[PDB]
């Protein structure tokens, strides 16, 4: 019996309890964006601004219900429109993750029929973040 | 007349109020579980997590009556329904204070008939508490 | 024209915008207790509890007017019925100031016929404490 | 395609977007209040009570709505009423920056045929301010 520890083991939605993408995982996710002629774009944050949280609340009513502080991330640029080239995708990775080596920094797509963010996952992390665990440290 | 501290004083609900239990006085509490045929069960938090707080109150209207975070703690493993053997349960404490050896480990039984926890005191503390008196200096 | 200072110069309510009590001032005003009847109390706090702050509002509904946490202080022992003696109000102020070195302590007086404090004022503060200005430099 | 940057780089209103203000540039924004016949004043503010924040609000019901704290800053003096000379604002600014070396320090004009301040900016920020960024910094 293995106990799935609660102490640093925080996750990042999709993706999140695999391991860690490998470039040629990235690589492979890209493909399938531009192969379903979805809309890349990247996004980041600071620490401080990485996690859901309600410091906004204090100032409302009885109206918090599905509000949360630091859903949006600062975009970087553009949606990638009518892109379809793969090593776009990742020379912007390169390019943003390099503007912003200490910030948190994820890959979306977005599917403009349904209008909705089709795929997003994590493909930056700070060095100095403490707050997460290696996949074989995730149970003790 | 000595006078009760206010600093660094505080306390861990049944039993906190005497001397820190011997090996001998929890294994005397352990027979005492099994005796009475209760559900051993070991829960434990980090210290950010281990007092009672407010938080969440932030996100509601006016229902903040006996809400408070902090109550849930992490459960180890499962409770040890069965359990009629106390070495088993000290075999659990050493090895749940083991794997977390700078959180708070509390020991606790439930009764099924009346659905409820029926006994609970803490086991251990993390070294680097200094929020709490020795039985000696708890007056001045 | 000079400029009242903004940046550390918290107050401490009656004479505390007078030069510092000296002991000559602090046992006149303890005569002046004892020559009313009025009943010599002291009252101490750590830092952290020393002022005025709105942190349990949280869990309230719109019933905040004059609820204020750190009113209370922690008293040092029991109020001194019968004292008619002003040494032994003085004594109490250094064995409470010693068991308590780094604590803020305030002296007062209960009439019970008003059933109201009727004097106060801080006796000690800590060593550690930058949030106040001397008499000189309260204004710039 | 130039990125603007979220981290450290916050802006102090009117004038912030350009360059810094040469000593010239504040000399014809002071000639501009004289022309027009406004009253110069200065306000000053420490680096926690600079920006706009929400704490007070937990005391409130539903009525949040355009409160703000840190909106008013302190007054340096009084309003330089009836001053016809730049050479007199210029002199306060420097006595103002001296008495609070550490402290924002922003310039204003009030109308009081309007009855409104018709002019403000930043002249000074702590030096040991890290949360903005120099204009060619802004956008990487």
Redesign the interface.
């Given at each position: 019996?293995m106990?799935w520890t609660?102490?640093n083991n925080k996750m990042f939605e999709t993706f999140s309890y695999l391991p860690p993408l490998t470039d040629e995982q990235i690589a492979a996710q890209v493909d399938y964006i531009v192969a379903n002629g979805w809309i890349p774009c990247l996004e980041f944050?600071?620490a401080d601004?990485a996690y859901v949280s309600?410091?906004?609340?204090?100032?409302?009513?009885?109206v918090?219900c599905l509000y949360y502080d630091n859903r949006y991330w600062?975009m970087?640029?553009?949606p990638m429109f009518g892109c379809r080239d793969p090593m776009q995708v990742l020379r912007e990775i390169v390019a943003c993750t390099k503007?912003?080596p200490d910030?948190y920094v994820r890959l979306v797509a977005f599917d403009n029929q349904k209008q909705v963010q089709i795929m997003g996952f994590l493909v930056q992390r700070p060095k100095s973040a403490r707050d997460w665990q290696p996949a074989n440290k995730r149970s003790?």
């Open positions: 019996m106990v609660p102490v944050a600071e601004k309600n410091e906004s609340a204090i100032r409302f009513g009885s918090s600062t970087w640029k553009l503007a912003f910030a003790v």
